[PDB]
Amino acid sequence: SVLTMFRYAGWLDRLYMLVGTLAAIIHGVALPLMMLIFGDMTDSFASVGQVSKQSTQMSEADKRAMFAKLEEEMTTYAYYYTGIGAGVLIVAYIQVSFWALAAGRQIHKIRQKFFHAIMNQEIGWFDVHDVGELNTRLTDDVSKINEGIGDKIGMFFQAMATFFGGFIIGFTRGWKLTLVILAISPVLGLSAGIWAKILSSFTDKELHAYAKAGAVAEEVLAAIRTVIAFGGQKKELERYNNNLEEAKRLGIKKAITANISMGAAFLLIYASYALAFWYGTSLVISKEYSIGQVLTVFFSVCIGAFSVGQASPNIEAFANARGAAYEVFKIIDNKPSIDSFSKSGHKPDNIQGNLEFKNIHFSYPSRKEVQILKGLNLKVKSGQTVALVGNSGGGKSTTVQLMQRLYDPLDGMVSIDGQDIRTINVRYLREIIGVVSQEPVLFATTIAENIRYGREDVTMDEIEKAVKEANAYDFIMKLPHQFDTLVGERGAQLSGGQKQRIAIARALVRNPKILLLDEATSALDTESEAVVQAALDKAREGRTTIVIAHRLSTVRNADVIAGFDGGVIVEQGNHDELMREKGIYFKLVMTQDVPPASFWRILKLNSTEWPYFVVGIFAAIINGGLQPAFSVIFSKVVGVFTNGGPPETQRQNSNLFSLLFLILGIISFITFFLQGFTFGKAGEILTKRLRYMVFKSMLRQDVSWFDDPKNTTGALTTRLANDAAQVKGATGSRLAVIFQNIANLGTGIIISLIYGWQLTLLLLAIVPIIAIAGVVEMKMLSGQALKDKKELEGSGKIATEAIENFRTVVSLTREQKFETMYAQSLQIPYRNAMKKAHVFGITFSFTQAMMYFSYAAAFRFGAYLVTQQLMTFENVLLVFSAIVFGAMAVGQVSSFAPDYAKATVSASHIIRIIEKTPEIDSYSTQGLKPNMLEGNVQFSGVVFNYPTRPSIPVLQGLSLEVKKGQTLALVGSSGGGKSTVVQLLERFYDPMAGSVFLDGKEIKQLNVQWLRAQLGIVSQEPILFDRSIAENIAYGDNSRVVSYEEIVRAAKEANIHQFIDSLPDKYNTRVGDKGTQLSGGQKQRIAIARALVRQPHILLLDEATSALDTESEKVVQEALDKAREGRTVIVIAHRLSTIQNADLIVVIQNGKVKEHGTHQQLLAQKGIYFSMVSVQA
């Protein structure tokens, strides 16, 4: 329906809308009512009040009185203008404030419930829809709903009230003439309706394009590190630019439709005027009407017609809001099958850990032609440990996901204590299960707050106990702020092992009955793995654990071990029995602040399209000056009309004025369309350019910039969209009409001046008082613009953090907590909106009241002028019309002050991002680019401290050397700085002391893009894009077009080609967001292929085999050994099997080197390396 919105009105918002509509009706009819009650000079309101001479014999006494009686009438009308002005003050304040309050409350509820619809969806829903658009929706569509259900509805109702009041006055003075002119009401209405429907469709398409553009920006900014490492800034900007172009085209179409609607309305009105004079000239010839009769009905219908003509932007805003309310309410109305918010379902008192998987058949929703499990059967007894082993992609993580009811199996049963889990309450089932995922993800908050996400009502003592069990106490105590040290998005400001241990503690603070641990020790060293294993063993008896580990040391002591082959368990049993059977387990085990000109400079960025601007200015001047010139030309029109010579022939011969009104309608159509279309196209080009430049500037910035807690994905994505939209809100047709109004005021100045100069001083006085309300509102609103921008950045941060990490939120049952945080983040903008409602209501009220007071003052001063014979009554009526139009112009400019307020704050910020220069500039062409590279990498006394934690020494005089054909093995404990070396070699940061040399040349002198071009890195937690497999390997070289054969060769070297070939759609298969749609090993192998397709001279691996099986690791090692010569390789490994083949191994701890040499040399001495290899054995 059209009215899907206003669903969350409630009684208070209904009462606001009803009383505001009543106030709008009263305010609209109050001007018709004045002329209805008082009509003796309403006939005079037809200018050139015909006196029919009578001045030949004016007694100067008969003349005298006449002027005194006329003065008395003007004074009475001035008093009534003052009274109507006070009434207008009250009713206009009510009309604006009530509608704004209702819109604000409804928008607050809409945002809250749209957030409580994304959190309610299933994981399968998230695996099919592009959820990277959703935040843009929350930032944009709702805002466009806010712009179409507030003040605009009241304004439209006021215009309608003026329309009906004017037509009621005509009916009183001429039923037939009014009925014929009213014949354009249905055609005008249908025109408005069709244009509104087209506007709604175009708005829906444009918002879809903007949502797609926001999704690219969400993916790229969340993966800026991969984007910078592989130099994909140009490609990621082209991807953004494509959706920017689509949105610009749709917006240009929107501008065309809206302005042709405006022009068509004005053309219809002017054609109706010509029809009115036609039929009235008939009524006069046939003698059934007088001239006064046709003039009055005209003045009465004209005001309402022009009010409706001016009401078109309100209809456009309503159409845009209804177009924006499509996807939001579509997502809201969607009801999941697995409802985590449902209260139904059994919550058994005594959950004994009896887990059964019976004939489990499952296929993922995104890839539903692939069978992952084919009659999986597995029984886990209370207090027992099952260890799931097998090849990568077999379905172990799928089984873990099915245990926590992330999906429902197509066939089979998952049961606890013999009870089917689809009948258990979803939330209750999930709280009794604690899960550590294959690649743990933290949240952008403190360590303690991250732990509290496992269980909200947790004390500091139990947090300490859990982090001691997780072997996390030591490093948390070591860095300052203790538990209050905030980590980055997804835990990026911690080492991989630290993040994994934090996740372990977060799962442990739940005291779960079912502990799922999927590769929970992949980022840990031998000591941390051993101590965490012992801590878990000390608590096994009370709970049941399902553990999946590619490190076969942990599964040695498991009570039962189950092997996956072909989607089923082929061998289940203990270690000794499986070794006796010599099955797949045996095979696995053997193979071992605000400048005020900011808007001016943003518009100066729009200088290329100056011809559009000049055409729009000319059109705005034409229509704005024709608005008051209407009174003058009708004065001349009235002149001849009233003049009667021959009775019938010449009166009908005066059809030239119907032609004049037709020409005026054509000119109005052309000028309104031109002005609006040119300004809207200029605004579309400007907003697209601003988004392009801001996104390019963000991709230019350093890694340290992205590590700033204020610069989070959600914050950045909100900042970009919000600044572009806020600047756009003060440009386009909104700007165009402003120029028109200036022209109007200018014309009002000249028409008065050529007709009477005494009344011009009244305009010169009343402009300041009608603009003081605007400037004081511009002030009040300017500071809360900054405040609301800062709060909306945090709201977007919370929303994006919840969306990008929805699986973690669902596993932790933290959807309600994130909803509470989102609601809290909305409170300050909500209260600011509620107070802005009253501020805008008072501003509009004061403006209209001073307009009416200006009319009263005009009538009184004109009475003085007429009494002293200084000026005539025809002149005081023409100029009074000029004063009315000038007051309108000043009032509308003052109403533009809120739009410009947001624009200037946003401009001062768009200008700054754009002019910001990073220290390590990746766009700079400067820098020495060596013609040859020999692969000699040296670190000399490198000292580095991370910008977000500058007081913690990370590397202290680190020195190392690696040459071509040599393999450097970085080993050591978690947090020692192994990944920091790789990040420094990529020049993500610059060390304060020491140097990094490439072939004897210090790396800060080399070109940054050139230096990164010869680096091929596999990261510790590899990130892929939601793009094809082939597109992901090809990101390994963005400079050239990578061929299909090269991609296939890289995949074969990465031992991933067979999976891609077997999978339907092959290399065109989309992986999901950050490799969600592939197993950890498959994702890591695709990352390896991405790094290898580049054929780098320097290959940096950061635990590149953590998620790989023994066979896959062997294949990758053989592939690397085949190409061992011809490049230099630096490997970070927690597995001694890969390390023992390295040419040289260095043990780095606390940023220093302790032991270095070959495997035999390190083994000879009983040092750290010997201790590690002995504890492993």
Ligand SMILES: CC(C)CCC[C@@H](C)[C@H]1CC[C@H]2[C@@H]3CC=C4C[C@@H](OC(=O)CCC(=O)O)CC[C@]4(C)[C@H]3CC[C@]12C
């Ligand atoms: C052309 C544009 C510029 C103005 C359109 C004016 C009317 C067509 C609209 C404006 C406000 C609307 C009203 C705003 C709110 C409501 C409450 C709404 O209530 C619900 O939808 C309740 C649903 C629920 O409780 O679940 C019913 C329609 C109604 C009366 C709407 C009827 C149609 C109205 C008068």
Ligand SMILES: CC(C)CCC[C@@H](C)[C@H]1CC[C@H]2[C@@H]3CC=C4C[C@@H](OC(=O)CCC(=O)O)CC[C@]4(C)[C@H]3CC[C@]12C
């Ligand atoms: C009682 C006197 C004083 C005024 C009478 C006015 C009517 C003759 C006019 C006013 C508004 C007009 C309506 C305004 C808009 C539309 C929608 C229009 O269809 C569309 O453009 C879209 C249809 C849709 O979206 O469903 C069809 C004509 C209609 C009903 C119009 C029919 C004629 C109406 C009722």
Ligand SMILES: CC(C)CCC[C@@H](C)[C@H]1CC[C@H]2[C@@H]3CC=C4C[C@@H](OC(=O)CCC(=O)O)CC[C@]4(C)[C@H]3CC[C@]12C
């Ligand atoms: C007719 C003349 C005499 C003017 C009458 C003015 C009233 C109609 C105004 C003035 C103060 C207004 C109130 C000022 C502030 C608020 C709080 C506001 O609360 C919110 O929705 C935000 C806070 C929250 O709920 O978190 C709701 C509207 C309300 C009651 C306003 C309702 C309309 C009021 C009573």
Ligand SMILES: CC(C)CCC[C@@H](C)[C@H]1CC[C@H]2[C@@H]3CC=C4C[C@@H](OC(=O)CCC(=O)O)CC[C@]4(C)[C@H]3CC[C@]12C
């Ligand atoms: C909307 C407002 C703030 C803009 C400016 C308003 C003035 C231009 C209005 C406000 C009150 C008006 C005055 C109200 C009453 C009088 C007294 C009146 O005095 C006489 O008749 C004097 C006769 C004599 O002694 O000769 C002359 C007009 C005047 C000054 C009016 C002139 C126009 C005034 C100054």
Ligand SMILES: CC(C)CCC[C@@H](C)[C@H]1CC[C@H]2[C@@H]3CC=C4C[C@@H](OC(=O)CCC(=O)O)CC[C@]4(C)[C@H]3CC[C@]12C
């Ligand atoms: C920035 C703020 C302070 C502006 C406030 C404006 C109002 C205080 C002014 C604007 C127009 C004024 C009115 C303009 C003209 C008249 C007619 C005037 O008539 C006479 O003086 C009649 C004398 C006679 O003939 O006996 C009486 C004051 C009055 C109502 C004025 C009352 C004060 C008003 C409402």
Ligand SMILES: *SC[C@@H]1NC(=O)c2csc(n2)[C@H](C)NC(=O)c2csc(n2)[C@H](C)NC(=O)c2csc1n2
């Ligand atoms: S009807 C031709 C012309 N009026 C307009 O163009 C017009 C657009 S919007 C509008 N008038 C609003 C609804 N009018 C007023 O606010 C208003 C208050 S007093 C007044 N207009 C005086 C009586 N108008 C004129 O003298 C006049 C002559 S032509 C004209 N308006």
Ligand SMILES: Nc1ncnc2c1ncn2[C@@H]1O[C@H](COP(=O)(O)OP(=O)(O)OP(=O)(O)O)[C@@H](O)[C@H]1O
């Ligand atoms: N969300 C998903 N959508 C579609 N397919 C998926 C999804 N998640 C996993 N898959 C696919 O299901 C299969 C099994 O994946 P799963 O994560 O269960 O394997 P695994 O045994 O845990 O692997 P690994 O040892 O690499 O961690 C793979 O082919 C994988 O690509």
Ligand SMILES: Nc1ncnc2c1ncn2[C@@H]1O[C@H](COP(=O)(O)OP(=O)(O)OP(=O)(O)O)[C@@H](O)[C@H]1O
């Ligand atoms: N972006 C960052 N901001 C601040 N501190 C960081 C950041 N990244 C890492 N650190 C810190 O720097 C230290 C070294 O981390 P690093 O990632 O280099 O270790 P590592 O040897 O690779 O660890 P692991 O074996 O756990 O992967 C740790 O104390 C870590 O918390």
Ligand SMILES: [Mg+2]
């Ligand atoms: Mg897995």
Ligand SMILES: [Mg+2]
């Ligand atoms: Mg690391």
